[PDB]
Structure formats: C-alpha cells, structure tokens
C-alpha cells in the first residue's frame, strides 16, 4: 500500500537515473572486470602512455599535472549537468522555490560526484572519458606534490563505499536523499524539502531491506556515508584553496566558480 508506492517511487527514480547518467555502475563494472564486448579502455599508467592516449580520450602547453587536474574539473562540469537533470526528475523538486533548488544543487552536487565516481573506480584506477580510458591510481599519485594527493581521498572513499555492493537501483535513491537535504545553508523553505526527503528515506530503507536482505544495518551505514561525504567535500575545498594560493594561471570553469563561491 504505502509500501507499494515506495517501490513505485524507487522504480521511477531508477528509470530517471538511467535517463540522466549514460555510464551506469552496471556498465562501468562490466568494463572494469572485462566482461563487456565493447572495445577495451586505453590505460594511462605513466607519462608515456598519457602522451599516447591523451588526444584519443580528450592544443595547450600546460604542465601534465595541471592538464590532468583541469580535465577532472571538466568532467565535474558534465556531471553537474547530469545531476541537475536527475534532480529535476525527483517528484516535488521542480515545484520547490527556484532559489532553493539552486541551493540544494550547489551544496549537494559534489557529494553526488564523489558517490558516482566510486562507481567508476576500483583499488587500482578510475575510468575516464565515458569509459574509454582508465587512469591508474599509482600514476595519479605520482603527480607533483600539490596534485599527487588530489584523487587519493576519493579512491579511499570509493574502496570502502564499493564494499557495500550497492547497485544502480540503490544508488538512485541514495543520491536523491542527499540532494533533498533540508540543512543546506540559506534554504528559504525547509519543511517541503524535509517532507520529500522523509519519503525518499522510507523508499531507501525498503529498497535496502529487499535488495540486500543479508546486509545487516546497511541503511545505517549509508546514513553514515552521507556524513562522510560532507567531510570529504570539506577536505577537497581546503585542498583547492591551497592549489589557488600556490599555483598560477588556473582557469576555473564558470559553473564550478558558482558552486565553489562561499
């Protein structure tokens, strides 16, 4: 009854997630485990392989570490746009005050970016360029000191998050819960957001009980991952300020400028 409506909501979110995000976790894991008929991704594991694959997985004369860092930022821009399209499919979201929709995305998108990045990661590297490339974790760690630790916190989160074995159906609801967070700074009307989130949280709990019946306390673990993601984003913002106060001539995409403006 209420339960049936919660399954219909879960399915609606899954279907909209499929519409919004071209590279799902299911498709990504198939590439990572080599169980797909598609062409294998080009592996970037050192400076030589970067040179060989850079143009295919995409001139300028920036140092390698800066080209990699800024490429990651451009992927983030595309992710923000996909997440925005997904948010608009969450029932109730587009009827919220428009300034509150902006606030929810501004303070939520990076948490979602990290969540979905885990889908593209294993302990050894990350899929890039819509799955056409694979950049190793060791190569990213080898970059000059300001940039050599930029991805490592994301890998650390991802290995632990991926141990929970969530699928795309689980992730669709988890992401929606995060977007509909009523405690973001400057929200004008918190109650309608909390009401939507309460229903999404009920849908998530039922999804996890049905889809992960042997995974004790998985719901509580995911609530804790939401808290962890906020701390991860905070640390990332700190690293960016460092990168800004030590590096020079670093163009930042205007969409990221809006999101990072504090």
């Amino acid at each position: 009854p209420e339960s049936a409506d919660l399954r219909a909501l879960a399915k609606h979110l899954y279907d909209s997630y499929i519409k919004s995000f071209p590279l799902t976790k299911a498709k990504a894991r198939a590439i990572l485990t080599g169980k797909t008929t598609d062409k294998s991704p080009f592996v970037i594991y050192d400076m030589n392989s970067l040179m060989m694959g850079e143009d295919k997985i995409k001139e300028q004369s920036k140092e390698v570490a800066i080209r990699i860092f800024q490429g990651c930022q451009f992927r983030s821009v595309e992710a923000v746009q996909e997440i925005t399209e997904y948010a608009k499919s969450i029932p109730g979201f587009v009827n919220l005050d428009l300034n509150d929709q902006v606030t929810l995305l501004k303070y939520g998108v990076h948490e979602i970016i990290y969540t979905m990045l885990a889908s593209l990661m294993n302990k050894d590297g990350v899929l890039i360029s819509e799955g056409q490339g694979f950049m190793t974790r060791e190569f990213l760690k080898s970059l000059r000191k300001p940039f050599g630790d930029f991805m490592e916190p994301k890998f650390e989160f991802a290995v632990k998050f991926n141990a929970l074995e969530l699928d795309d159906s689980d992730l669709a609801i988890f992401i929606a819960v995060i977007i509909l967070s009523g405690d973001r700074p400057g929200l004008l009307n918190v109650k309608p957001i909390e009401d939507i989130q309460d229903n999404l949280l009920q849908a998530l709990e039922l999804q996890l009980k049905l889809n992960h019946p042997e995974s004790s306390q998985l719901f509580a673990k995911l609530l804790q991952k939401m808290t962890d993601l906020r701390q991860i984003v905070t640390e990332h913002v700190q690293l960016l300020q460092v990168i800004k106060k030590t590096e020079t001539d670093m163009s930042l995409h205007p969409l990221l400028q809006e999101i990072y403006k504090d």
Binding site: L98, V102, L105, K106, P254, L255, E258
Partner: peptide, 11 residues
C-alpha cells in the same frame, strides 16, 4: 547570474 538556475529552467 546563476548558471545553475539556467540549467534548472532549460527543459
């Protein structure tokens, strides 16, 4: 102006 607002309004 807000770029996020523009994305939110573009159907």
């Amino acid at each position: 102006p807000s770029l996020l607002k523009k994305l939110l309004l573009a159907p």
